[PDB]
């Protein structure tokens, strides 16, 4: 039995919410995997071609966060570069 | 041989029942009453739109020649036995010409704009109904056209 917080958005939005939203992104990818898999099974049960079910994939968004040069990667890379700051971090984001 | 001068004689007879001052004119308020007494069959909204095309107040009068115009207007747009059969046939559970006397009450008194307690009592006394079973509707097509 897993109890977890839902997606979060406020007037002022911060790292706590960013992390929460990333966890929710991951859970949503899993949810899409689970649903898409069960749909592929039902489609094969009903003999319907898989090419009709378009797969919506948030992997490009997860890659924007967790992968190399992702928003988290550049945050850690900024934490150990000398005199890094929220402003230059933001600049790296825009540049990248 | 419809709309010859012979048929117009009974149209003058039925019109004369509502021309109570006796001047060749009737009110809009009974125009449906006389048309359906003569057995021509318009809907409620259709009749109301035909009245309000003549007067936006709705409260008025129509002379005998223009009453014949309104009769002729409806006669141009007359139903058929198969068009009336189609209307019953969408409620046929089996496909044999029979409809439930329970669902008939739902069609008469809950669906559509509806039939009154008086219309129900009068029709049910003649039809003699005491039950909810399947009943022949090809009879209704023939007898009510």
């Amino acid at each position: 039995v897993l109890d977890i917080y839902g997606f979060e958005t406020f007037e002022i939005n911060s790292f706590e919410q960013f992390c929460i939203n990333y966890a929710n992104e991951k859970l949503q990818q899993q949810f899409n995997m689970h649903v898409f898999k069960l749909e592929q099974e039902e489609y094969m049960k009903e003999q319907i071609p898989w090419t009709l079910i378009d797969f919506y994939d948030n992997q490009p968004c997860i890659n924007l966060i967790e992968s190399k040069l992702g928003i988290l990667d550049l945050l850690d890379e900024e934490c150990k570069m000398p005199k890094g700051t929220d402003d230059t971090w933001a600049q790296k984001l825009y540049n990248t | 041989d419809q709309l010859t001068e012979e048929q117009i004689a009974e149209f003058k007879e039925a019109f004369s029942l509502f021309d109570k001052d006796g001047d060749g004119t009737i009110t809009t308020k009974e125009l449906g009453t006389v048309m359906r007494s003569l057995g021509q069959n318009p809907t409620e909204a259709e009749l109301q739109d035909m009245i309000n095309e003549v007067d936006a107040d709705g409260n008025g009068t129509i002379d005998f020649p223009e009453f014949l115009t309104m009769m002729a207007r409806k006669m141009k747009d007359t139903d058929s036995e198969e068009e009336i059969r189609e209307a019953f046939r969408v409620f046929d559970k089996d496909g044999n010409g029979y409809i439930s006397a329970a669902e008939l009450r739902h069609v008469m008194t809950n669906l559509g704009e509806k039939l009154t307690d008086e219309e129900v009592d009068e029709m049910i006394r003649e039809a003699d109904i005491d039950g909810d079973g399947q009943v022949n509707y090809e009879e209704f097509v023939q007898m009510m056209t």
């Binding site: 039995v1 897993l2 109890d3 977890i4 839902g6 966890a23 069960l38 | -």
Partner: protein, 237 residues
Amino acid sequence: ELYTKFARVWIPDPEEVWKSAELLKDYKPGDKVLLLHLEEGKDLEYRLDPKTGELPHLRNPDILVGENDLTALSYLHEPAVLHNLRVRFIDSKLIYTYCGIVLVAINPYEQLPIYGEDIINAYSGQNMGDMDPHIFAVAEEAYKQMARDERNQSIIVSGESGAGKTVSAKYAMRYFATVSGSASEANVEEKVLASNPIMESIGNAKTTRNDNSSRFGKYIEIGFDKRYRIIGANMRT
């Protein structure tokens, strides 16, 4: 197109997010504005743009609304969902609804008899579609899948902390204990429930928008033997 006279449509509103309206005249391309009859007045008018081929959201037919599963609707959009949940909750006091695989639980802020043991019996052995949606139906689905296949099972509960996730979990464990027939030996429920005040004291906080917000993922593994008798729980965080 077929946006005809008497067609019902949704229009946005500030007090209640969406309002129902009735199309007072047939739409045709180039009829750039619609005559709409509202509950508040016989005609109030709404405008459409050539840009995007703009149209108001159409409304689902009445047979479909109020259904136990939101995927049964033909138009899938915000007002239809909101309406279905509003009606089921407000008029029928139904606090549970399905969406695809998901179970939606509406917090009533009140105790209800729906958690009784007779209902536990009523859900035991039933298939998912054979019953109206309830947390016991999710618990039963997991329990049957654990028995039918070796693969393990997880119930994931998501929402705000105020929504009452603990109650869902409490009843799911009680359901398992009861359908397993384990409560004549197991004493896990009493202790697991008695663990909540400490977990809330240590793992719970007051946020800008909520009081008693939970700030971690808590995983309770209810262990079973080879006969599906309960074994005492393992907690991970």
